[PDB]
DNA sequence: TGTAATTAACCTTTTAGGTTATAACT
DNA sequence: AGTTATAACCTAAAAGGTTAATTACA
């Protein structure tokens, strides 16, 4: 019989909720999400099992959204092809040292100019010596 | 003898202040800035003349910081060379419709991959047909 | 004239860019 | 040992977009 730690006006009751989620303009509903939900407000409390499941769904969704505009495999492929490590790739293309790990895991979207420059150099790798 | 509207503990007194400012890691001091300053806290109040002068200095500083890594003239040049309007350029290179106006005015720094892709296409303009 | 092109405030989301941890590998 | 990649966490900036206010310019 726990009370909502937020509004203090509803009880937390175990059930399920479809959770809308938006990333980079793409909308989805994460459905049947188990948790404790406040009768009164939006406060929700998930256990570890529920949090983990939920976050995995969110991570999965974002990766599929990013994969609409660039395949993580294409990025890794062009990088290893230019014989760059991720840190070397980030120095040239920008984004900070973690940049390419984030693109290649599918968690962050590269700049449109990063993608397009990767496409130019995929067909014309020798051009890297011009701008390195 | 107007009291500080922020801390209520100091009077606003007319004088000058050197104002540190940082942009994209570059630090400067905007010197001798006229205004009303609170004796107690950092609260300052500038009239229109003082605000305008100050903001012009801030805008000037940011533009010179951006110009360290990319000349606005180089950007306009490559864009008009690829026969792109700013909106057309933004669609290909990213950044939203206002992107290129912000770069070309010197107010925002383009992605390192935007700069480098602009460099590739400056020497090899025909390559735009590959990724457009 | 009025239509496209650009500059401008101004707003929210997302990456840039970096620190520190962890772990695998060389 | 240092090298590579992944991971979470930060702040500061640009991405991306809406609206308005301007400047070329048919
Ligand atoms: Zn509640
Ligand atoms: Zn004060």
The C-alpha of A121 sits at a distance from chain B's nearest C-alpha, in angstroms, of 10
Cα–Cα nearest to A77, from A129, A132, A115, A130:
A115
Q: What is the experimental resolution, given in Å to one decimal place?
A: 2.1
| Whole-number Å distance between alpha carbons of A16 and A55 | 15
Burial class (CB in 10 A: 0-12, 13-18, 19+), A124: middle
Strand locations in A2-125 (E)? 12-23, 26-38, 44-45
Q: Classify B98 as helix, strand or coil.
A: coil
Instruction: Identify whether the C-beta of residue A18 lies closer than 8 Å to the C-beta of residue A29.
Output: yes
Q: What angle do CA B91, B93, B98 make, to 5 degrees?
A: 60
* CB nearest to B131's CB, from A95, A110, A120: A120
**Closest C1' nucleotide to B96's CA:** D16
What's the Å distance between residue B69 CA and nucleotide C5 C1'? 26
- Strand C nucleotides where any atom sits below 7 Å of a protein CB: 5-10, 13-20
Domain B1-59 has CATH 3.10.20.860: yes
CB atoms within 10 A of CB A42: 11
Residue of A88, A99, A111, A113 to mutate for B, most B C-beta atoms under 10 A: A113
Cα–Cα nearest to B19, from B9, B31, B5, B4:
B31
The C-alpha of A76 sits at a distance from chain B's nearest C-alpha, in angstroms, of 17
| Whole-number Å distance between alpha carbons of B70 and B92 | 19
Handedness of CA B80, B82, B87, B93 (dihedral sign): negative
What's the fold here for domain A60-132? 434 Repressor (Amino-terminal Domain) (1.10.260)
Strand locations in chain B (E)? 12-23, 26-38, 44-45
User: Per-residue b/e over B18-30, b at no fewer than 16 CB within 10 Å?
Assistant: ebeeeeeeeebeb
Ligand minimally distant from the alpha carbon of residue A40:
1
Residues lining ligand 1 (ion), CB within 5 A? A 4, 6-7, 10, 38, 40-41, 43
Could you state, in order of their start, the residue ranges of all structural domains in chain A? 1-59, 60-132
Could you tell me the CA-to-CA distances from B73 to A11, A36, B7, B22, B83 in Å, in that order? 62, 58, 46, 24, 15
| Whole-number Å distance between alpha carbons of B86 and B80 | 9
């Amino acid at each position: 019989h726990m009370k909502c730690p937020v509004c203090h006006q509803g009880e937390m009751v175990s059930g399920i909720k479809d959770i809308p989620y938006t990333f980079r303009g793409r909308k989805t509903v994460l459905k049947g999400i188990h948790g404790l939900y406040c009768v009164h407000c939006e406060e929700s409390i998930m256990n570890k099992e529920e949090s983990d499941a939920f976050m995995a769904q969110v991570k999965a969704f974002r990766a599929s959204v990013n994969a609409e505009t660039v395949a993580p495999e294409f990025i890794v492929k062009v990088r290893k092809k230019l014989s760059l490590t991720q840190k070397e790739a980030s120095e040239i293309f920008g984004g900070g040292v973690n940049a390419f790990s984030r693109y290649e895991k599918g968690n962050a979207q590269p700049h449109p100019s990063t993608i397009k420059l990767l496409r130019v150099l995929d067909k014309h790798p020798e051009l890297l010596n011009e701008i390195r």
